[PDB]
């Protein structure tokens, strides 16, 4: 089965450089041109590169033209996307995709999971973890507030996730160059506060893990 694995990447300050690698499997690699494609946070997509079957020819769109490098070793069935002189408009999700052929045109088939390039220069920041508690009816709504973390991946897990079914994860908005999300758990009155309700905040980038038990006031 086609398997595409993107590697490398993270937060990089403007002017820094990076190289990315896609691992391929399950198909003869040399026989298929390969490409990288960017995904902006807006769920908008853009086409950054392609390299042909052998070393062959390389194709660039205008915007990144000259700033990026694409390369191949078919011996390992692995790619290299070499970037340099990055700037902030480059932060996005990047994917590798095998380019194949139809009657008149080119078409993408399998896409890997992709890694995340972030061009910006604050420091790696842990989030502040605050409980959410009421000051009324048979069912209880609670929450945890994750505020002020720059590195974007975080994890909210309620009581080790047993309650996830009533847990609506709210996406993170950015302001003050630090990210703000929210996660709420809904519980009947019999469980809370009769039993322990604690969200697990996990911010792998700063490797910070904060447990805040939610008790009423």
């Amino acid at each position: 089965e086609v398997k595409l694995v993107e590697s490398g990447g993270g937060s990089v300050k403007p002017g820094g450089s990076l190289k990315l690698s896609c691992a391929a499997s399950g198909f003869s690699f040399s026989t298929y041109g390969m490409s990288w494609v960017r995904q902006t946070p807006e769920k908008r997509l853009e086409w950054v590169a392609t390299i042909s079957g052998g070393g062959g020819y390389t194709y660039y769109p205008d915007s990144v033209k000259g700033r990026f490098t694409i390369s191949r070793d078919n011996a390992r069935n692995i790619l290299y996307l070499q970037m340099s002189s990055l700037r902030s408009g480059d932060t996005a999700m990047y994917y590798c995709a095998r380019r194949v052929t139809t009657v008149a045109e080119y078409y993408f088939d399998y896409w890997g999971q992709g890694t995340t390039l972030t061009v910006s220069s604050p420091k790696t920041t842990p989030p502040s973890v605050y409980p959410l508690a009421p000051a009324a009816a048979s069912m209880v709504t609670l929450g945890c507030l994750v505020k002020g973390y720059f590195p974007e991946p975080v994890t909210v897990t309620w009581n080790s996730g047993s309650l996830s079914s009533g847990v609506h994860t709210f996406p993170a908005v950015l302001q003050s160059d630090l990210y703000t999300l929210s996660s709420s758990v809904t519980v009947p009155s019999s469980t809370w506060p009769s039993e322990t309700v604690t969200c697990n905040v996990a911010h792998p980038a700063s490797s910070t893990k904060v447990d805040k038990k939610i008790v009423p006031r």
Binding site: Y32, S52, G53, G54, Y57, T101, V103
Partner: peptide
């Protein structure tokens, strides 16, 4: 042998 054919459509 080394010419790149990978970029030919079906047509």
């Amino acid at each position: 042998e080394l010419i790149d054919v990978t970029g030919i459509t079906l047509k």
